[PDB]
Design a protein around this ligand. Structure first.
Ligand SMILES: CC(=O)N[C@H]1[C@H]([C@H](O)[C@H](O)CO)OC(C(=O)O)=C[C@@H]1O
Ligand code: NA
Length: 385
């Protein structure tokens, strides 16, 4: 029932963000390097250029301390990132000593303005507090003070990702008062058939209305949403939140419109180990498809599975295909956060976290990011369907 299964299967994959332990580790032009890269996000722009974002975690793999927001672009608008030589060297969206810049959540607007929502916190604060920094300082716990809370920032590019504006703090506008912890995405926002932008965040969606690249933002509060959410517009044109659960088990899904959402409920078809996932609107003509990617396991992040739903409301996803069927060598053990885009040559492009595990669950375990391309035929020709 899917003509794509008859096309020749295609896959290729290679490390795109190379951690400090690897040959040719990724460093900025300034010489600044990174122990680990985590928290991927990818979008294809209106030109066809692909922009890949990540957190550059300077000294360890930990969520706190000196973390910068880094990126790579495809060298041209037409190369579709097919091989390592198609990608530019590492660049920086925003960096700094005193800050923790993370949670890249991009969305491409009609005018090709690429918006990138981001989180910021102080480099001396952490989620739990009392964590040890490289210099032996102990962090303070994230709190509701201006200095100590998670901020929500916005930067954009008007030149196809070549340069980025100094990020603007939108916390007072788009984060509820009295909040301490926060998250936006991470992964991506979307543009609706009806023209609005929707960016998933902790307990809310951020809605963009008005002129492309000159949007008015507002907050849609959600009941029972997760901290790390994904959003897609399903074939029926409705909205679909698919969120990381607070405890290991299953993805938490809710459906709605810009007028409001129904309740979140576990999707028993989508096991999840309490980790971020990604979702992608593929096409609208028969057969319409939504793509989903996470670790398909209640316990482990190393069960990465890409799936297709043919449902108008994405009610059920197929078994799909295990990413390990096309394993990458020399970049650690694949599994974790992910982000997906369509490419100009009819593939799906996916960024996927990978972990060398050289320090076990400890702070010195190097983390890299894999770039995969595969077509629908590759997914559909999986042996476990
Ligand atoms: C530090 C931060 O801003 N987000 C972190 C997030 C958070 O701790 C919470 O558990 C999610 O809801 O979890 C993870 C994780 O790999 O599990 C990575 C993120 O960097
Ligand atoms: Na930083």
């Amino acid at each position: 029932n899917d003509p794509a299964k008859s096309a020749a299967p295609y896959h290729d994959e290679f490390p795109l963000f190379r951690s400090a332990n690897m040959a040719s580790p990724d460093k900025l032009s300034t010489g600044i390097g990174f122990h680990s890269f985590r928290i991927p996000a990818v979008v294809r722009t209106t030109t066809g250029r692909i922009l890949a974002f990540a957190e550059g975690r300077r000294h360890t793999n930990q969520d706190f301390g000196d973390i910068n927001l880094v990126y790579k672009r495809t060298k041209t608008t037409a190369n579709n990132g097919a091989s390592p030589s198609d990608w530019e060297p590492l660049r920086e969206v925003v960096g700094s000593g005193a800050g923790t810049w993370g949670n890249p959540t991009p969305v491409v607007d009609d005018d090709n303005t690429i918006y990138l929502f981001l989180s910021w916190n102080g480099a001396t604060y952490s989620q739990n507090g009392k964590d040890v920094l490289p210099d032996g300082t102990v962090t303070k716990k994230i709190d509701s003070t201006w200095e100590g809370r998670l901020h929500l920032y916005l930067t954009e590019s008007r030149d196809d990702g070549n340069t980025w504006s100094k990020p603007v703090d939108l916390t007072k506008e788009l984060t509820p008062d009295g909040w301490a912890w926060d998250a936006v995405g991470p992964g991506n926002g979307i543009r609706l058939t009806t023209g609005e932008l929707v960016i998933p965040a902790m307990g809310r969606n951020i809605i963009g209305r008005g002129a492309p690249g000159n949007r008015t933002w507002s907050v849609q509060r959600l009941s029972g949403a997760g901290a790390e959410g994904t959003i897609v517009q399903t074939p029926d044109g409705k909205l679909y939140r698919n969120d990381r659960p607070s405890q290991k088990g299953y993805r938490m899904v809710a459906r709605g419109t810009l007028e409001g959402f129904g309740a979140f409920a576990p999707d028993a078809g989508l096991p999840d180990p309490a980790c971020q996932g990604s979702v992608l609107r593929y096409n609208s003509d028969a057969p319409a498809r939504t793509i989903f990617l996470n670790s398909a396991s209640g316990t482990s992040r190393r069960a990465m599975r890409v799936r297709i739903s043919y449902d108008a409301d994405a009610k059920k996803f197929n078994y799909g295909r295990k990413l390990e069927d096309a394993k990458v060598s020399g970049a650690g053990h694949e599994g974790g956060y992910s982000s997906m885009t369509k490419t100009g040559d009819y593939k799906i492009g996916a960024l996927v976290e990978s972990d060398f595990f050289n320090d076990g669950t400890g702070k010195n375990s190097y983390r890299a990011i894999i770039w995969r391309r595969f077509n629908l035929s590759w997914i559909l020709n999986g042996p476990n369907n």
